[PDB]
Design a protein around this ligand. Structure first.
Ligand SMILES: N#Cc1cccc(O)c1O
Ligand SMILES: N#Cc1cccc(O)c1O
Ligand SMILES: [Ca+2]
Ligand SMILES: [Ca+2]
Ligand SMILES: [Ca+2]
Ligand SMILES: [Ca+2]
Lengths: 121, 121, 121, 121
């Protein structure tokens, strides 16, 4: 299993120790509070109201937790994933990233605490 | 495992099929958008700015997901629990409940989608 | 999980710390060599050529590993059980026992090494 | 999980669907009766009394269940493996094989029923 923190102001995201292999079943639970700029903070699903001005993940809200598996496109995580299997032809290290617009991470604050483990399959 | 919806306006809570037994390790993942009255909706950690006006769980924000296990008090769930073991002598059916003040559930809207499973132990 | 030895000469059986509860999925792996009397030894499926002369479990060979769950009748374990669920209304502490004739355990020797764990469900 | 049979007379062995990857925890349960030639049959630990006349696996008895992981040598499985991590960081497809002398599989009979799964990690 892997446990760690993803900072909202880290545009590169945090690589985890989890290498996703074909057929792996994984669980993710994310918690905590972060902001893309405003004084209000949001949970790992982000801010439902905020328009999309070029987010790294168009399938999630601004301020949501997303991931890459190896060199994949962004995948929404939000609060987490329950005994989840990735699409065909996605494999490699899981990287966790705060969903914001490239070049706009400098005014971000807070972080999410994340647990990931592989499940029985 | 158990999957289902926990309506924010459901004061009695949602009874699951899960009986928590001594030594059980469980995982809960909760997702979605709910409100205790306003247009704005919050995720399963609730509204970190809202005062406690007599919440059924004083250890979680207004609009958080909480649970009872048998004869237990309310226990915070928020976004979920990763490979979690209950306190000593806590056992019985899991009921999930939206965290609001008794008598104030009628103006609530939306729901959380919740997955509960027992893990390897 | 539980790990230990089940001696062939133990008529009372080996009490494990594992309480089987309704809906539990369990895995048992058993290994090793034991005898009901002769100088030869058999594995956990016992001696397929020995007649049943009053075995505690008529559904397993003499020198097989069997079990009770609470005060159930004996249930064959043999080499083990993979992600196994008990019949309805069977619950309680797992006792592991060597399959022999009551009052004839005294000339037995050797032991099986046994692992039990609860699986994701 | 993979569920199959290993025929005692199959010299090439049974390729499974299981790809063992680094960090994987696996459980195997093997059951049944098989012969390397004689009328008698043995369980998955094989015949403890038989010499090694050129077995494919030199640290398991004649008539035992053994496996290869990718490019590994033969690894003893016997009655099975409980939440087991492969030594030497081996990886690749699991092949199951009955332990007999190469060129002598023609007179074998019976089969082992085998279940393999990946476990929580
Ligand atoms: N907490 C709270 C609360 C206070 C007033 C009215 C409501 O509907 C509420 O949910
Ligand atoms: N071990 C062995 C062996 C030796 C001779 C003939 C066989 O069929 C065997 O299986
Ligand atoms: Ca920003
Ligand atoms: Ca309300
Ligand atoms: Ca005896
Ligand atoms: Ca042969």
């Amino acid at each position: 299993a892997w446990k760690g923190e993803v900072l909202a102001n880290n545009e590169a995201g945090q690589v985890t120790s989890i290498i996703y292999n074909p057929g792996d079943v994984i669980t993710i639970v994310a918690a905590g509070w972060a902001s893309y700029g405003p004084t209000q903070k949001w949970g790992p699903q982000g801010d439902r109201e905020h328009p999309d001005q070029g987010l790294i993940c168009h399938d999630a809200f601004c301020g949501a937790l997303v991931m890459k598996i190896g060199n994949s496109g962004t995948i929404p995580v939000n609060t987490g994933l329950f005994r989840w299997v990735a699409p065909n032809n996605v494999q490699g290290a899981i990287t966790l990233i705060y969903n914001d617009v490239p070049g706009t991470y400098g005014n971000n604050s807070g972080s999410f605490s994340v647990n990931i483990g592989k499940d029985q399959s």
